[PDB]
Swiss-Prot record:
Its EC number is 3.4.23.22. GO terms for molecular function: aspartic-type endopeptidase activity. The active site is at residues 35, 199. Belongs to the peptidase A1 family. This is Endothiapepsin. Residues 17-328 form the Peptidase A1 domain. GO terms for biological process: proteolysis. It comes from Cryphonectria parasitica. Disulfide bonds join 255-290. Coiled coil: none annotated. Keywords: Aspartyl protease, Disulfide bond, Hydrolase, Protease, Signal, Zymogen.
Length: 330
C-alpha cells in the first residue's frame, strides 16, 4: 500500500504545515501537524475543555462506529516550545492520503495549552518520530507510520515541504519525479527517539564550506533551523545590522537586508537554503526589525533541522530495520 497527502502552510510565514487526516467511520477530517519530532497522534475532541477550543475542528468518538475507548490509557506531552496537551485514548481507523490503519491510537485532548487554543488552523498533531517517545501510559502506543509500515510497499515516508506553497507527504514510496539529482542517505541514531543524524558542515552565502560534524534532528514540527551558536554567529555576521536580541528572543535583522543563503552538508552532498527562506518577517506588525530563521540551539540541548532546512530538500525518512535519512535537492 501507499498514501500521498498534500501539506499546506498555515500562514504566510510557513509557521507550520497542516495535512488532512480522516479519523473514524464515517470519516471525520481533521487538519493535523505532521511532526517528525514527536510520537503522539493527538486531536482536539468533544472531550477538550470548551474554553480551550477556539475554531478547531474536533474529533467526536461517539459519532464513530469504529471508535473504542482504550480503557485506562492516558497521555500527556510537553513540547520544546513550552506547549502541552493531555487526555485519554481511543483506537479508531485513521487514513492519510488513501493509506488506512485500523486500530490506531487517537489521543483525545482533555486539556491543551494556550498556544494550541490560539492556533485555530491546527486540529492536532500526528507524530512521526520513533514510537519509543509515545507518551501513552500504561501501555505505550505506536505511531501511524509504525502501524502502517508492514503494509507499505517500502518502509519509508517522504517530506516535501513547500516554500510559501503546498507540498506533499508520501508513505510507502519515493516519488522519483519530486527531486533533482540523487538522494544522499546518512545514518540515523534512534537512541533519543528522534530522526537524529550528523551533518558534515556548512557554508554561509558564497563562502567556503566548513567541514564540521553537527548532530541534530530532522523535525517537521519545528519552524526554524536551530544550530550551534558558533555557526549561527557566523551566519548573522554576514548581515549588516543583525544582532541577537534578548528582548525579542533571538537574532533579528533589518527588514531592508538581503539575506545570504545557508548551505548544510549531507555526506558529500550539499543542500542550499535560499536567503529568502530565512526571513520570518517583522517581529511585530509594522516593525522594521525582522526575525531570523536561523537561531541558536544553545538553550535547547539539541540542534534542530526544522522546516527552514527541510523545505529546501526532498527528505526520505527510511524506517527499515536500520533507519536512515535521505536528502535530495529539488
Amino acid at each position: 500500500s501507499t498514501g500521498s497527502a498534500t501539506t499546506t502552510p498555515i500562514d504566510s510565514l510557513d509557521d507550520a504545515y497542516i495535512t488532512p487526516v480522516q479519523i473514524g467511520t464515517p470519516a471525520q477530517t481533521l487538519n493535523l501537524d505532521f511532526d517528525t519530532g514527536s510520537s503522539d497522534l493527538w486531536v482536539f475532541s468533544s472531550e477538550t475543555t470548551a474554553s480551550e477550543v477556539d475554531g478547531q475542528t474536533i474529533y467526536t468518538p461517539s459519532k464513530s462506529t469504529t471508535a473504542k475507548l482504550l480503557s485506562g490509557a492516558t497521555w500527556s506531552i510537553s513540547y520544546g516550545d513550552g506547549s502541552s496537551s493531555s487526555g485519554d485514548v481511543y483506537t479508531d481507523t485513521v487514513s492519510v492520503g488513501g493509506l488506512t490503519v485500523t486500530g490506531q491510537a487517537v489521543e483525545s485532548a482533555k486539556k491543551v495549552s494556550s498556544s494550541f487554543t490560539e492556533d485555530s488552523t491546527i486540529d492536532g498533531l500526528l507524530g512521526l518520530a520513533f514510537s519509543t517517545l509515545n507518551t501513552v501510559s500504561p501501555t505505550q502506543q505506536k505511531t501511524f507510520f509504525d502501524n502502517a509500515k508492514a503494509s507499505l510497499d517500502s518502509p519509508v515516508f517522504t517530506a516535501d515541504l513547500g516554500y510559501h506553497a503546498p507540498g506533499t507527504y508520501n508513505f510507502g514510496f519515493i516519488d522519483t519525479t519530486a527531486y533533482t539529482g540523487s538522494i544522499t542517505y546518512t545514518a540515523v541514531s534512534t537512541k533519543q527517539g528522534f530522526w537524529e543524524w550528523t551533518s558534515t558542515g556548512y557554508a554561509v552565502g558564497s563562502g567556503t564550506f566548513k567541514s564540521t560534524s553537527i548532530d541534530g534532528i530532522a523535525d517537521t514540527g519545528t519552524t526554524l533551523l536551530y544550530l550551534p551558536a558558533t555557526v549561527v554567529s557566523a551566519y548573522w555576521a554576514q548581515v549588516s545590522g543583525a544582532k541577537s536580541s534578548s528582548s525579542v528572543g533571538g537574532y533579528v535583522f533589518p527588514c531592508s537586508a538581503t539575506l545570504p543563503s545557508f548551505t548544510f552538508g549531507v555526506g558529500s552532498a550539499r543542500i542550499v537554503i535560499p536567503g529568502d527562506y530565512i526571513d520570518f518577517g517583522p517581529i511585530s506588525t509594522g516593525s522594521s526589525s525582522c526575525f531570523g530563521g536561523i537561531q541558536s540551539s544553545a538553550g535547547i540541548g539539541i540542534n534542530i533541522f526544522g522546516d527552514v532546512a527541510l523545505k529546501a530538500a526532498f527528505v526520505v525518512f527510511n524506517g527499515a530495520t536500520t533507519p536512515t535519512l535521505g536528502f535530495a535537492s529539488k
